[PDB]
Amino acid sequence: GSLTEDGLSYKEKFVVRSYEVGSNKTATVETIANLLQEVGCNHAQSVGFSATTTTMRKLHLIWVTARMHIEIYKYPAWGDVVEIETWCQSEGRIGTRRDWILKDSVTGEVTGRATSKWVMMNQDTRRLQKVSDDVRDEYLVFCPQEPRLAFPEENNRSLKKIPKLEDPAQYSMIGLKPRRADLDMNQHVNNVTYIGWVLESIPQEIVDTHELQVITLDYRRECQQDDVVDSLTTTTSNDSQFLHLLRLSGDGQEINRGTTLWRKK
Amino acid sequence: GSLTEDGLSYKEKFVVRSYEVGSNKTATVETIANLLQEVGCNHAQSVGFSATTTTMRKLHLIWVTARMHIEIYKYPAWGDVVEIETWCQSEGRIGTRRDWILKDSVTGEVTGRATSKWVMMNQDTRRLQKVSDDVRDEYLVFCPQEPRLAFPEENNRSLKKIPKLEDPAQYSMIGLKPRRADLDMNQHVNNVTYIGWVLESIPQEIVDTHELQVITLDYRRECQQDDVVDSLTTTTSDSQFLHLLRLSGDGQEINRGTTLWRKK
Ligand SMILES: Cc1ccc(C(N)=O)cn1
Numbered sequence: 189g190s191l192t193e194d195g196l197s198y199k200e201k202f203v204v205r206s207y208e209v210g211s212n213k214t215a216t217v218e219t220i221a222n223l224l225q226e227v228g229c230n231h232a233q234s235v236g237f238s239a240t241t242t243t244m245r246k247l248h249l250i251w252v253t254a255r256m257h258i259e260i261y262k263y264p265a266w267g268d269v270v271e272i273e274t275w276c277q278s279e280g281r282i283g284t285r286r287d288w289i290l291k292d293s294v295t296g297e298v299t300g301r302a303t304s305k306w307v308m309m310n311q312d313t314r315r316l317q318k319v320s321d322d323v324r325d326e327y328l329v330f331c332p333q334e335p336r337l338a339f340p341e342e343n344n345r346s347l348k349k350i351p352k353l354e355d356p357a358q359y360s361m362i363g364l365k366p367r368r369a370d371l372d373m374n375q376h377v378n379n380v381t382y383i384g385w386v387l388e389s390i391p392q393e394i395v396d397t398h399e400l401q402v403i404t405l406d407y408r409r410e411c412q413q414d415d416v417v418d419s420l421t422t423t424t425s426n427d428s429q430f431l432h433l434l435r436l437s438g439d440g441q442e443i444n445r446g447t448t449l450w451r452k453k
Numbered sequence: 454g455s456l457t458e459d460g461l462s463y464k465e466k467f468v469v470r471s472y473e474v475g476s477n478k479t480a481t482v483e484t485i486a487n488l489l490q491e492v493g494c495n496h497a498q499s500v501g502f503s504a505t506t507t508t509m510r511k512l513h514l515i516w517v518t519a520r521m522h523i524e525i526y527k528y529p530a531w532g533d534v535v536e537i538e539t540w541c542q543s544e545g546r547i548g549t550r551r552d553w554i555l556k557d558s559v560t561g562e563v564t565g566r567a568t569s570k571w572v573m574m575n576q577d578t579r580r581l582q583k584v585s586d587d588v589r590d591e592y593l594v595f596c597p598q599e600p601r602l603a604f605p606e607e608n609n610r611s612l613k614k615i616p617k618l619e620d621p622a623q624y625s626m627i628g629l630k631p632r633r634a635d636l637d638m639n640q641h642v643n644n645v646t647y648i649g650w651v652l653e654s655i656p657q658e659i660v661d662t663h664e665l666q667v668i669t670l671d672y673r674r675e676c677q678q679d680d681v682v683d684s685l686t687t688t689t690s691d692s693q694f695l696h697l698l699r700l701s702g703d704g705q706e707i708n709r710g711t712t713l714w715r716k717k
């Protein structure tokens with residue numbers, strides 16, 4: 189992987205592995221989301237981070253994901269090479285955004301796109317906050333100054349408001365718990381695990397007959413290592429759309445909400 | 454990745470990823486086991502396999518793992534390049550063996566080693582069987598003819614018999630279930646998931662203060678996608694543990710194993 193000529197974006201190629209693919213011998217959406225995370229980490233390292241700025245470490249502030257939105261046109265096959273380009277943009281005092289473009293390395297065609305919203309939080313109190321001027325000035329030298337959007341379109345799916353699923357859910361998967369492989373290097377549940385948990389409540393017949401085209405997920409609260417989660421899904425719809433909700437098994441505290449759009453194979 | 458000069462082994466380099474490491478910023482043993490499977494799959498593809506031979510596909514026969522044994526001296530750090538060499542050997546009528554050597558790409562030193570025993574099974578009836586002369590003759594042209602062992606040492610840990618853990622277990626993790634990410638391309642639970650399940654019943658304090666040095670796991674029966682597993686562990690001692698995975702309901706054994714840990 190490497191920063192592009194202008195130093196304002198980063199590219200990396202990945203060869204899809206045997207254990208990374210599903211029944212169609214193409215990369216799962218969780219494999220894609222892990223690759224997105226990996227290229228994001230390599231971009232941060234290349235521009236001098238370790239993605240907390242100098243002022244952030246002083247104030248015990250970190251970036252956390254508020255939303256992930258992914259659209260896939262073609263999932264890369266086992267053994268194929270996929271190239272991913274990523275860049276960040278400041279969104280004033282709201283937070284930051286990281287975007288990605290996925291391309292087939294041989295054909296050069298765009299096979300997917302993704303966008304994510306990140307908010308600043310105090311590491312210890314978990315209190316969200318706006319971006320201060322000092323922090324915004326420190327990371328703007330690593331971002332394109334003019335807007336550069338993976339999802340330019342006027343009323344595009346990436347910014348749509350997601351409602352809260354009402355009981356009773358049409359489908360459910362109960363008692364989901366993370367194991368050590370679901371944790372990151374800081375012992376927090378990896379953001380991709382929540383995508384897998386959301387998808388668990390989609391019936392296997394939909395997965396066997398449809399291709400996942402779009403997934404939008406809001407992150408509200410984290411699942412701790414000793415927590416237990418319930419995954420709830422209700423059909424809202426040639427295409428099938430679902431509304432999703434992850435909540436703690438006990439008290440029913442919301443941890444995530446999302447939507448998925450599937451196309452008939 | 455590529456076959457070596459003689460065409461009897463395969464090598465591949467991997468750069469350790471951010472999500473592949475644990476709290477020490479080094480690759481987990483599940484990441485290592487996934488890399489071992491990946492280089493094994495790339496070796497099979499390079500020598501013409503689908504690792505089922507032409508005869509195997511005709512009588513609906515497949516290879517299945519009976520045992521996995523891994524010894525790690527140093528786990529590669531996040532961003533490091535690790536080189537893995539793999540090869541297969543026939544073990545007469547019993548089955549086949551796949552071995553691996555892990556090396557740091559910069560220093561060239563051996564950082565780990567692994568060995569696995571594979572048995573032939575009918576894919577439909579699930580009945581185990583010996584290797585016929587016909588199948589054995591078809592894959593011997595892809596193996597070194599003289600023995601080449603990752604674990605040469607006489608009476609070494611890789612061939613030790615594992616006893617069955619007796620109730621009550623000292624530690625347990627109950628109600629473990631696979632999710633879609635735990636399945637392979639054929640909708641079977643990935644062999645590496647069982648390693649993660651075994652390790653789940655080791656207390657977090659042992660993991661925080663020790664380094665996993667050796668893991669030996671026997672595979673007896675598969676966990677189906679709708680099955681639920683209990684992971685049981687008892688200290689037998691460095692720290693050594695005896696492990697057992699069984700189905701939550703009837704208590705049917707799916708795996709047994711041992712782990713050896715060194716104080717950090
Ligand atoms: C592409 C794809 C479809 C379904 C799932 C799942 N976990 O159900 C993951 N990836």
Ligand SMILES: Cc1ccc(C(N)=O)cn1
Pocket residue numbers: 368369475480481482483528649652653655660665
């Ligand atoms: C190297 C290492 C230690 C512990 C575990 C685990 N899952 O407990 C995995 N990998």
